[PDB]
Amino acid sequence: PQISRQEYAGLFGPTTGDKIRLGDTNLFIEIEKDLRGYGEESVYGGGKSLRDGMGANNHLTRDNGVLDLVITNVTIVDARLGVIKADVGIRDGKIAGIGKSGNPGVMDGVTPGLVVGVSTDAISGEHLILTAAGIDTHIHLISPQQAYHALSNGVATFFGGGIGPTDGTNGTTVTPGPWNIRQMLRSVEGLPVNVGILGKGNSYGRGPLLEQAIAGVVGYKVHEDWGATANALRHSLRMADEMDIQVSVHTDSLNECGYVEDTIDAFEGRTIHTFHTEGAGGGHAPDIIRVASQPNVLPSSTNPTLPYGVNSQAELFDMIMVCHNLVSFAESRVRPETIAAENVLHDMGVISMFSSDSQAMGRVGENWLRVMQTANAMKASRGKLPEDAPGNDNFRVLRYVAKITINPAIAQGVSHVIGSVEVGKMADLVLWDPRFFGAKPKMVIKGGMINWAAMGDPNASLPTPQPVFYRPMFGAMGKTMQDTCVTFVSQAALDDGVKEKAGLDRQVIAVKNCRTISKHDLVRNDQTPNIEVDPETFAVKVDGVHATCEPIDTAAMNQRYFFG
Amino acid sequence: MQLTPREVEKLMIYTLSDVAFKRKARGLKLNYPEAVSIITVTAMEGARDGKSVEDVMKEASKVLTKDDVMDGVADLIPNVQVEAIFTDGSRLVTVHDPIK
Amino acid sequence: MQLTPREVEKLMIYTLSDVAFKRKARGLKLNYPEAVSIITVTAMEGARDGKSVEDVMKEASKVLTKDDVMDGVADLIPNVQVEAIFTDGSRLVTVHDPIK
Amino acid sequence: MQLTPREVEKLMIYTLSDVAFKRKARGLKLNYPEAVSIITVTAMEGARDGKSVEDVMKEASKVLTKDDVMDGVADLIPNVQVEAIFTDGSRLVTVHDPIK
Amino acid sequence: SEQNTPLGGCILADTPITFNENKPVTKVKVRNTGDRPIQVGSHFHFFEVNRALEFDRAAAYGKRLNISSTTAIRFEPGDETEVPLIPFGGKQTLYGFNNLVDGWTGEGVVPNSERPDKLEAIRRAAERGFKS
Amino acid sequence: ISSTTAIRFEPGDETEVPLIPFGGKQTLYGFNNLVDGWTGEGVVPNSERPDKLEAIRRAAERGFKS
Ligand code: NI
Ligand code: NI
User: Fold this and answer.
1) CATH entry, C1-99, from 2.60.120.10, 3.40.50.720, 3.30.280.10, 3.10.20.580
2) Does A346 qualify as catalytic in the annotation?
3) What are the b/e assignments for A115-140, b being 16+ CB within 10 Å?
4) Does residue A109 contact residue A100 with C-beta atoms inside 8 Å?
5) Alpha carbon of E22 to those of A541, D15, D65, E45, E65: distances in Å?
6) With an 8 Å Cβ cutoff, are C72 and E8 in contact?
7) Residue C43: which of C76, C10, C3 has the closest Cα?
8) Is A463 within 8 Å of A471 (Cβ atoms)?
9) Mutate to test the interface with A, among F25, F26, F51, F53 (most CBs of A within 10 A)
10) N or C: which end of chain A has fewer CB within 10 A?
């Protein structure tokens, strides 16, 4: 038979050629591909297709590869797969398939591995967007409660450091030394997010670095506050290459031991992650932004400058002046010209990642929000990216998504296990209502279980009655919370028995592929142009073109959606 | 007073609606949370006042207009649901398309 | 309403400031928590009202006086900080020496 | 404001009594939780106002009548107890047979 | 007095604090030859400061600024300032910074000659680009 | 020149050769132990990086004819 699109959509959601508005933004995504045929559509319910002997197989044991979970008729927004409509399948807390789910007994075209059976539960994705969960590379471990704010914006992995609210943690992403590391590994067992910890890089010999490596860190953080010296850099990077771990940097803002060019030379063409690349959050003043030209630099921005708004200068000024309990350090630190420039460079694919800088100038619960907010402000000011397709904003959206998903993963050497909706990966997933995209998710799926969700009255006759607020779920409960969460570590540590030694019940996974990567390995954000900054007026030129845009008055996904 | 989890939870509603009612009275156009609050409490208070589910439903579907809300909020609130304590017990109230 | 941890936390502020505003209106001289509440909500409400960070700052630095507070409270409140949701997003507001 | 668990807990009281006072002013006869709220806050507010334990006690034993409550509620509230912060410190206030 | 101190306040005595009193002081003249501001702290090894600073580098060997712990001196572009210098204490072992020394910075035992590791350092500064 | 091919310099002959930079990270370890690092330009047009000048000086006194 023949059915109208409108009727089809109502049953099954949007198909190839259909367009979806991402909130109250002016971004419109379009479905590129529909992997789940027509006429044999898998839906859970009374009188529906995923019933016994019909869409569901009723004779196969689980060891035949029957699924543990299926997400049906869902729109996948992923930086590597693009914008597709598919069934998604989970087995052993891993993504087994993307395609057409059902029962091959009674159905043509069931994707191998997507057999629904006796073992299978179901999620109805018809009117939903599925993303990879975000990854926040710049976490200060000041407060355990950050995790909750994060899960509530669709972030489920933390990279950083600290030891609670010490003055060192308030300023840097460091967990210093083997005692403190051990302690912190043990603590995070109580958190419903994945974690990897960073160590203190400012050391003269190998000894003090190696120490922390074996103790379990995934990285070394080089910070001004503890000394952002050439020495620090050099030894940190040399060790890193030895240990297959990452190095992150917060450069010398004062220009004490050098200018940016000297820092660059301290990198010695070695892979490095550069936090708040613009400089409002720290770095060689006015011109740390020039590191975004280099192939060995994996650049990030912290989220308080994105998007650039009318209140942005006022805020930042006042913030530093309290951050550093303080004026010529101030107005040199806080530069309208470079902030605008950061925005543009993002849109170009020259700054490759978003981050929070949690409770050290940024907002742990706003990375997915701000990303979307930025994409939309930038469409307005610049129009369509050249690579956009005329009818849709896919190219753009997808650039931005890479920023909080696959790119962070790649940077910290965990793209083998997390960061994209792809076969063989850990199911660290987020479900969104389009109406709420970026802002307010439906749920978080954390190791194949729902860990976090928007839930109303537990006494009510439905799950939807008011008050609806974010709450832990069963994956967040008991021994499952550890079972479903990863503690990232060094291979050195893994090999030394960190899991036993530290007594960790978390999944313990070795970071890998941190040192052979470059800017060009980054997804949709692989551009290395010439960047020039004017030491007087702080004006930024990118391949000779002035890089600016005007501040926004009104943000999307903002006062409409939030009481906060 | 021996407050149960259901009782305590409902204090959130009361607090957000008080803020919301103050804002609406200043002429502010309401957002999503705020609007949901006002509809919810209208029902709840009706229940307490002794009305029927049918009657509270009407009442709550009429408290807010398109004008009283920020553009688009309607699209965000297709229905509102709350459990209220009626004379005959706890009952689910669905309020259909409350922002007309 | 899909309340996030940040949203829920802010209900504490609203509840303490309502109590505080009632007390000030009885002529009670305010304490530390109460005073911090009133300054905080002033900012927050400004944000919502559509003002600039600059403008709310002024407003909040002027709501309470030395007379309106209990002796010494000033020494306890050198600055107040809150994140509010401005038209352009969430922003930190520092209010410098609010009790003059 | 550096709110302690004891401080935070007391916000529940303030929220329920505001609702309760609104209801009583509509002519609704109060229930158990609501009535306990009003007596509790009366004490608490007295304390803050600078009264004696003796004096607040009287005050609180007089705020609600049999008429103002739902039949039987009296039997449910033989006494009410709360800790309040008096000029000389935290003190227990028992209010004996408050619904007369 | 006591009657006037704010809540948590301090009543400070009168006597000034005297620091670094024993330590011999070398004055050097510093010009910032770059286009960007340079700021140096109290415990940094002055010898190893930003290449763009032009001063008598030899004179700053084993030295720090004779200022208050935790404070700093700002050298704006194209300005000249005289700064007091003092030696480091303890063992006079300086590792890291710009990897100019990575050792002992003491005088040693012979008055009216230089140790050769000092002359090495000084030569190395020169050809790494550290302006004198 | 073409990957895998070579240029022959016979005794006492002069040839002009085309040169191009290395790609990737421009990190050169080994050979005659002249660099054992980064060979990039860096970020400052119309100056040389000091590690380059070091290299060049070191060539000179290891006997590498210029
Ligand atoms: Ni930083
Ligand atoms: Ni940071």
Assistant:
1) 3.30.280.10
2) no
3) bbbebbebbbbbbbbbbbbbbbbbbb
4) yes
5) 52, 66, 82, 19, 14
6) no
7) C10
8) no
9) F25
10) N
